[PDB]
Design a protein around this ligand. Structure first.
Ligand SMILES: C[C@@]1(C(=O)Nc2cncc3ccccc23)CCOc2ccc(Cl)cc21
Ligand SMILES: C[C@@]1(C(=O)Nc2cncc3ccccc23)CCOc2ccc(Cl)cc21
Lengths: 304, 304
């Protein structure tokens, strides 16, 4: 029992972190097989960030201008290429610690773990979600660029995020491992504002199921609702609309607890309308939306 | 910017997790050098837990009754001993992945990361604190026993907790790595109730400093207070008394923000008396107490 914001064990990803330096800029790289992936803005100075022409800046760089250090040993760079907003640096040595891996592009609402790194060294691990506005609410300082987000399925690491930028609002933007940004963000120091950060409804419901499983049941009411009636309330509270696909995904949690998905929707509707009244659910005074239904099942079943 | 409940990278500890089985009971063990540490209740059946005589039960066990598996390979047990509530199983092979380590007994209010494990395999990592009532609010299922709590200082892992038990209230109890329980808990399935779970005041103040550093400043007021006046309020709200030692420990955060510790105490006093009024601090609607002043500095400075 108990329910925590749990991250995946980070060891498999720690074995891939390297430091990449180009000129005077240093950030993190991800070493998988004989390729090091890193944000393309490793070639920029702080002044270049205001209006960078990456293709033009990259012409002035050769393989020997990219310094890659793994632990305390230098890797030899034998090739370089730009794919969207990431650089792929071919090295002469395959990472001996390369885990089984995939590159995946996640959908908004999906969660992942982040291994925050500085100078190719891991500082910490935390769990977050891709927000509906395609930002992440991370914890990143200068030099954290190139830190990655991932999920693990038994022994396969699915890398889904590489950190690139902090917006003026303190929220974070980045790319998948093919270098495509999540959302409309561009790798330039210009006015980029995030859209509405709505609440991931299907995740809130999963966390309410997690609360019932772990004994917190005060919020369960005598009501039910319909998808359309619930969604009228969800729109009013800046919650994402719930679809039948989300109801289907909550099926296992509904079966485990014996609480129909629409009855849980009616409990959530009352919590939105009445508030918490100073009470807590799973030690929180807000409705938590960074646990997917898959996360709740995984944590409540002990998947390793 | 951004502030997350961050755990230490778990790789160094994942390299130490093994499975220990005795008879029909299986739990986790921690393999460091040529010794495997695990809860002594690995020798008990579910029926033995009601009233166990560990010394008597251990007489019926020989080295070959303890099965230790690391990954998928079996370790040879060449000795066994009981130290307080843990068993130390001497194996014939030193763990090649043994990190630099220390065994430390933490004080209430101190935080650590937990690598939750099942069958010697890591499931996840999360951050928690030793509560003032010597319980931890973890996320542990049956078979998680022997999972460990730790802190990392550059390359040295200080192990501080080994999981043993879940109380009927859903909170957790365990030992240090010498087998001594934190608090008054005993490894027996009997009525053990936890004492008052008070709020770790010095941690709340550190997290308020973290909020100011990260831009959340609405709660700062025009007031100051004294240690004695603040403590009258803290006692009323089940907060731990703040001492001059705690004020000293908040010195670096006070210097970074320019906010005197007693002025932050006055802001916290007003938050306790007035509540949040539906507002949030660092995305929380409650005052967070599982970040120490050291954690706030570490996260806000990027220590690797
Ligand atoms: C490199 C830089 C940045 O956001 N980096 C950072 C990333 N994370 C946390 C940060 C905390 C504090 C300071 C910078 C942070 C700064 C200049 O403007 C830009 C513009 C675009 C891009 Cl793709 C990166 C950047
Ligand atoms: C072994 C056992 C236990 O608490 N273990 C567990 C530890 N963590 C999470 C649990 C979640 C669900 C089921 C059990 C959990 C059960 C019997 O009573 C006792 C009594 C004493 C001790 Cl030292 C251990 C135990």
């Amino acid at each position: 029992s108990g329910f925590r914001k749990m991250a995946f064990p980070s060891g498999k990803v720690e074995g891939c972190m390297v430091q990449v330096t180009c000129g005077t800029t240093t950030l993190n790289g991800l070493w998988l097989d004989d390729v090091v992936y890193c944000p393309r803005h490793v070639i920029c100075t702080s002044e270049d960030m205001l209006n960078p022409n990456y293709e033009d800046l990259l012409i002035r760089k050769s393989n020997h201008n990219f310094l890659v250090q793994a632990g305390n040993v230098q890797l030899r760079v034998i090739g370089h290429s730009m794919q969207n907003c990431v650089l792929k640096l071919k090295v002469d040595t395959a990472n001996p610690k390369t885990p089984k891996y995939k590159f995946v592009r996640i959908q908004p609402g999906q969660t992942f773990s982040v291994l925050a790194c500085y100078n190719g060294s891991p500082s910490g691990v935390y769990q977050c979600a891709m927000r509906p506005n395609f930002t992440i609410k991370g914890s990143f300082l200068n030099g954290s660029c190139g830190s990655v987000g991932f999920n693990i399925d038994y022994d396969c690491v699915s890398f889904c995020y590489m950190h690139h930028m902090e917006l003026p609002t303190g929220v974070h933007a980045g790319t998948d491992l093919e270098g495509n940004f999540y959302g409309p963000f561009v790798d330039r120091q210009t006015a980029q504002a995030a859209g509405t950060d709505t609440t991931i409804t299907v995740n809130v419901l999963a966390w309410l199921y997690a609360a019932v499983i772990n004994g917190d049941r005060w919020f369960l009411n005598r009501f039910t609702t319909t998808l359309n009636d619930f969604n009228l309330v969800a729109m009013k509270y800046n919650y994402e609309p719930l679809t039948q696909d989300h109801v289907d995904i909550l099926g296992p949690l509904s079966a485990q607890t014996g609480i129909a998905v629409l009855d849980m929707c009616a409990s959530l509707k009352e919590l939105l309308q009445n508030g918490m009244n100073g009470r807590t659910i799973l030690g929180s005074a807000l409705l938590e939306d960074e646990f997917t239904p898959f996360d709740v099942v995984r944590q409540c079943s002990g998947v390793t």
